[PDB]
Subunit: 238 residues, 2 copies
């Protein structure tokens, strides 16, 4: 008295205000567990702030300070915190702090492991089948509950775009996925077809497609995607 200064080292975290003073908060962000007398703060990584175990006269009008806990340098990572909160379902990496304090920043890029879910342009699958390269779009692991970005492929495969509204469905891997066209030239749909509806000598089987687009595989007796204009057929003779 009056004032003081306790050079707050890195491993600061908990102490006791002196005479049951009424402390306050004024710094950079909000990450307090203030009691009313002593205190206890939660994962103050990168937190520049201070508090004065104050005093105030009710009757008269003045307010002083008996102990200042000052700070000017960052706090590196410390005890058991989490560097990754959530947002809707994206795993933005915790920028300025820890749990429930997590200020947002960048998304978490991909390093390695073994995946268990993947989502893209408005659809989600589970295994390599049908996709040009696995991983893609964005994915996650079995342990967690939010996605990790990695790639940013264009919802497009030469004229064919994977939106989420209109028109003809088709199955990549194992899941129904919508698709929306663009041009009108030759173009291989990357999505295996929906329903094979049919109807020895001259036998034919056929599906449903868009304009001038072919879907794998080619017919046997012709070796040329028997396109047509709206239906890619599949012939078979005796």
């Amino acid at each position: 008295t009056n004032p003081s200064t306790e050079e707050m080292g890195d491993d600061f975290g908990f102490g006791l205000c002196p005479f049951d003073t009424s402390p306050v908060v004024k710094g950079k962000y909000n990450t307090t567990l203030l009691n009313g007398s002593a205190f206890y703060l939660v994962c103050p990584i990168g937190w520049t702030g201070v508090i004065e175990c104050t005093a105030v006269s009710p009757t008269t009008l003045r307010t002083e300070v008996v102990k200042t806990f000052r700070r000017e340098k960052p706090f590196p990572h410390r005890m058991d915190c989490v560097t990754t909160t959530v947002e809707n379902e994206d795993l933005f990496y915790c920028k300025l702090g820890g749990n429930w304090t997590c200020v947002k920043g960048e998304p978490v890029v991909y390093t390695g492991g073994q995946v268990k879910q993947c989502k893209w342009c408005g659809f989600d699958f589970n295994e390599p089948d049908g996709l040009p390269h696995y991983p893609i779009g964005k994915c996650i692991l079995a342990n967690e509950t939010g996605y990790r970005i990695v790639d940013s492929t264009d919802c497009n495969r030469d004229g064919v775009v994977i939106s989420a509204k209109g028109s003809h469905e088709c199955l990549i891997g194992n899941t129904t996925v919508k698709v929306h066209a663009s041009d009108e030239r030759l173009g291989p749909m990357p999505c295996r077809p929906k329903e094979i509806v049919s109807s020895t000598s001259c036998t034919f089987n056929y599906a449903k497609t868009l304009k001038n687009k072919y879907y794998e595989p080619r017919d046997s007796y012709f070796q040329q995607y028997m396109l047509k204009g709206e239906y890619q057929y599949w012939f078979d003779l005796d």
Copy 2:
């Protein structure tokens, strides 16, 4: 006498030995009508040399030239001197000489008129709908007996050459021209095919082509000449 010298006129014809003497001809071509003690010269178009009334006396053997008739510059054309013969079935421009005296040579040449037969690669031809330009190769009229000569586009029209031994029956005009292959790259069949064969549930026709050559026309449906490698096909898809 002795040894005259009758420079026969440019309009010479009938012959007249004197006091009985079997003639002897020593000319360029072979165009002398020998009729006893009197010759007759029919069409000597550009012919020189000499011809002499030689006599034979059985006592001594002093052959005596009494009447020698001579021509000093080539003879012109006059009356019934046909200068247009043939060989088997091939006309040739009779260089020098007329009736039964066609020392043939260079070929005839076209210039117009009114035709009704043309010939090319092992098969005779009639109507214009087909070969790239009517007429072509060699042709004749209705009055003559043999063909002329005007053009010579080789019997090779895009990959395929046309010859005489099989192996596929394809038609042009109203004829029936044989044809054989030669390479693999995509080429257009220049002869409408012969027999159509079929095989509603899935109606379709098929004939025979070769490797990658297409018999016109394309089905409006798949709007591209289909093929297998050994056949070309035709649907009716209502």
